[PDB]
Design a protein around this nucleic acid. Structure first.
Lengths: 151, 100, 79, 99, 114, 127
RNA sequence: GGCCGGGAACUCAAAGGAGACUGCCAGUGAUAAACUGGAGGAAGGUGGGGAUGACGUCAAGUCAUCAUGGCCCUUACGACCAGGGCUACACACGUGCUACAAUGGCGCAUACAAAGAGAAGCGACCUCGCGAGAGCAAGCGGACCUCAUAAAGUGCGUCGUAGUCCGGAUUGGAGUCUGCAACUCGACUCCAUGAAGUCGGAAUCGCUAGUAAUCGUGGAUCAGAAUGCCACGGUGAAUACGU
């Protein structure tokens, strides 16, 4: 907006593990006004991931997110009837949001049986540092590196 | 509307009032489950023999002041335009502009 | 249409068909009543039925019983 | 032997005037009455098109309100019923008496 | 299993496998299974010979194939020969049962620009 | 002697009664587990008591009417908050700082002429 | 079993009242108007939503709702009646509903609403029918009776990526109801058939909070005919660095 101020909206912690990050993750996974379905999917996937990795659910989730967070992006500008791709920094909140969205988008496009299995496999691959989300992060970094002369 | 189109409705209402009793039951025993084998054949025949304008489903609600056959409200007997005019002039008890 | 009510037919057509079949005649019977059902009694006559502009003649056969007279006088012209 | 009176109107000031008159007149003649209980209002709503020909998003919305009141008297005398049936009310109030 | 003139699948529950006959739906399937006396959560491949014979006898009470095909045939050609409104539409390729022709009617017309 | 509270949220109303001793809960002649089969719901009903150290020192008798699961849970929480304030009158600061004392007042917006919802508008064609 | 005696506390009903004013504390500012924070309070800076449309513009729309100058016909461009058409079909466009599935389809069992209508009307309980319905027949001009079961949800099975236990056009055969009369041209019911479609080229639209998205409920017009119009509640998000 032009002459406005945006305030933060209070978020409520998840029931079992009091994770605001996990409440946000459920929100982003959510679809069509149904929250219980998303909560069930998230909990099932996290449980299977913990069984597979032999660590806490929070720790596995955090490792996955750390392996996918970005740090520099590219923003468009118009100069002389042409387009420039100026590199810019990223804030922590935007880092978190981008990571979660990329993870969910990657998971939704696989070919397993159920969404819980899809998400578990995607999170495990991210933890091992290979997959579509990390591919996207690498591509973003490369496109930011190619344009360092326009800083 | 037209004067002839207004007269037609008077005719229809009069005939309905005239033949109501005859049409009511003396002819509508066709729905009877134990009337007879074909003592209702004559019932259907002599029902269709009656004038067509006597069936209540051949009447159309028209505005009492103008004659318009579209946009009718049963509570007031008028069309939307005349309802609005009378409401603004203040001649319909209890009615006003609403908001919530 | 519903049973326990019987078929439909108009009296001014029933009477004409009865008279013709009782006596012997072959001239066509004029009718504007496209809504009258066809009876077994009516086999072997010729009924000219209105369609808006003229009278179309139909010669009755055993296979036509139970239908409406209006299915054999179409009303719209195309090509 | 108990009498019940129902009052209906389009205006609450008028209804209050009539009901107060009823209650005071009744109490003037010995018998006892349970106060006037207010009952739910009714709202009838209409929506109309305001142009003569074509415009469909131009509309007016109207409503009518009906106000309702109840009074009941339990142990009357002979003269109270006479007075109550003799009474008179304003133009826009409707009253019903049940024995 | 080969119940009627055709074969039927041998890896799906009976109430569904029977549907492959041309003339048996989800109602007749359950009715036939109930009359025979076999559970409906059964894979056909677990049946015996006598059970299949009972199924054949049960299925042999409805018009199933060939006969009903011929029936619909004679119905349609009876209409066309009679030459009524429905027969005219049936020969001309347009929808019977009313419906609009100014737009749509593509099931009875075909792809655009015949 | 009992302590009373009244709660409202969306289109729901709740009556709450509090006594001391041996924590137990009944909502409409049923227990928490049977009534609310949603973990979020149970957590909302339990929040105000956990915020203080009286989880297992009071008995609760509650009735509720109108709305849905989330609305009824919010109403019950509000009622508990009012009852506790009446009973103690020294936890007001903590309850306010948590935010349980305010009456949430966002209802459903009405439908308007020419739109197809409160704010959704039909499709447009510049031609 | 609020079912009984009872009670007038609480929820609720509709009548009179109180409350919000930059009124108080600190800083900036021209001794100014105002601006940025805090306390208390259900609510804080026009708290949320509605009605309310300035002088004027487009010879903008409506002689067919009504009224009205001028012109025109009056054994006819004015009455009355039966049957047809406005529902046509090589083709082009705008607004919608239902999909192309597993955050799902089918079976069994069970939480939680708001707002409306009823006299030539709304119609319970009981019996018959697989079903739409039929026969007897209470109550109700109504916070009392009827319409009238909310659905998504929750628990247990089954289907295992197939044009399928996905989707439901189209067609044959039997019926029901309103109506003098359902061929052209009505709405529903049962049995059988089982189409295109696997997320849509260049274009292009709506939305800043209890909003978008999703699920059900009612009313006017009406003998009978909504997926459209006007209303009601349940679950309930993402993002705003900046010009």
């Amino acid at each position: 907006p032009r002459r406005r101020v945006i305030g933060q909206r209070k978020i409520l912690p998840d029931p079992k593990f009091g994770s605001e990050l996990l409440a946000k993750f459920v929100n982003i996974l959510m679809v069509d006004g149904k929250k219980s379905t998303a909560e069930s999917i998230v909990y099932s996937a996290l449980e299977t991931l913990a069984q597979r990795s032999g660590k806490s659910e929070l720790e596995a989730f955090e490792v996955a997110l750390e392996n996918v967070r970005p740090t520099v992006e590219v923003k468009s500008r118009r100069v002389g009837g042409s387009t420039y791709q100026v590199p810019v920094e990223v804030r922590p909140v935007r880092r978190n949001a981008l990571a979660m969205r990329w993870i969910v988008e990657a998971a939704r496009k696989r070919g397993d049986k159920s969404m819980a299995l899809r998400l578990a496999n995607e999170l495990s691959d991210a933890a091992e540092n290979k997959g579509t989300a990390v591919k996207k992060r690498e591509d973003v970094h490369r496109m930011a590196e190619a344009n360092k002369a326009f800083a | 509307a037209k004067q002839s189109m207004k007269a037609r409705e008077v005719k229809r209402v009069a005939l309905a009032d005239k033949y109501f009793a005859k049409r009511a039951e003396l002819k509508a025993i066709i729905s009877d489950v134990n009337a007879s084998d074909e003592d209702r054949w004559n019932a259907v025949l002599k029902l269709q023999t009656l004038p067509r304008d006597s069936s209540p489903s051949r009447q159309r609600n028209r505005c009492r002041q103008t004659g318009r056959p579209h946009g009718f409200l049963r509570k007031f007997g008028l069309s939307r335009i005349k309802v609005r005019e009378a409401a603004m002039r203040g001649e319909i008890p209890g009615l006003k502009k609403a908001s919530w | 249409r519903s049973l326990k009510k019987g078929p439909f037919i108009d009296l001014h057509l029933l009477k004409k068909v009865e008279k013709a079949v009782e006596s012997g005649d072959k001239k066509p019977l004029r009718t504007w009543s496209r809504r009258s059902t066809i009876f077994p009694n009516m086999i072997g006559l010729t009924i000219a039925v209105h369609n808006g502009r003229q009278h179309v003649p139909v010669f009755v056969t055993d296979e036509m019983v139970g239908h409406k007279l209006g299915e054999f006088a179409p009303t719209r012209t195309y090509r | 032997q108990r009498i019940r009176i129902r009052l209906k109107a389009f205006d609450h000031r008028l209804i209050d005037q009539a009901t107060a008159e009823i209650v005071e007149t009744a109490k003037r003649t010995g018998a006892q009455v349970r106060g006037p209980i207010p009952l739910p209002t009714r709202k009838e709503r209409f929506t109309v098109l305001i142009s003569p020909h074509v415009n469909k998003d131009a509309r007016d919305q109207y409503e009518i309100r009906t106000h309702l009141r109840l009074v009941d008297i339990v142990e009357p005398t002979e003269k109270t019923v006479d007075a109550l049936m003799r009474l008179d009310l304003a133009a826009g109030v409707d009253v019903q008496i049940s024995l | 299993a080969r119940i009627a003139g055709i074969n039927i699948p041998d890896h799906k529950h009976a109430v569904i496998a029977l549907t492959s006959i041309y003339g048996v739906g989800k109602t007749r399937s359950k009715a036939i299974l109930a009359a025979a006396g076999i559970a409906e959560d059964v894979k056909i491949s677990e049946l015996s010979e006598g059970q299949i014979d009972t199924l054949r006898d049960e299925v042999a009470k409805f018009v199933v194939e060939g006969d009903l095909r011929r029936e619909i045939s004679m119905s349609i050609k009876r209409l066309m020969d009679l030459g009524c409104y429905r027969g005219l539409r049936h020969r001309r390729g347009l929808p019977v049962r009313g419906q609009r022709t100014k737009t749509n009617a593509r099931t009875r017309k075909g792809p655009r620009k015949p | 002697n009992q302590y009373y509270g009244t709660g409202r949220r969306k289109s729901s109303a709740a009556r709450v009664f509090i006594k001391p001793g041996n924590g137990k809960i009944v909502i409409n002649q049923r227990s928490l587990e049977q009534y609310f089969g949603r973990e979020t719901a149970r957590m909302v009903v339990r929040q105000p008591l956990e915020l203080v150290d009286m989880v297992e020192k009071l008995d609760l008798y509650i009735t509720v009417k109108g709305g849905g699961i989330s609305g009824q849970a919010g109403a019950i929480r509000h009622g508990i908050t009012r009852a506790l304030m009446e009973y103690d009158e020294s936890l007001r600061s903590e309850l306010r700082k948590a935010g349980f004392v305010t009456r949430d007042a966002r209802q459903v917006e009405r439908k308007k002429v020419g739109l197809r919802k409160a704010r959704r508008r039909p499709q447009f064609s510049k031609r």
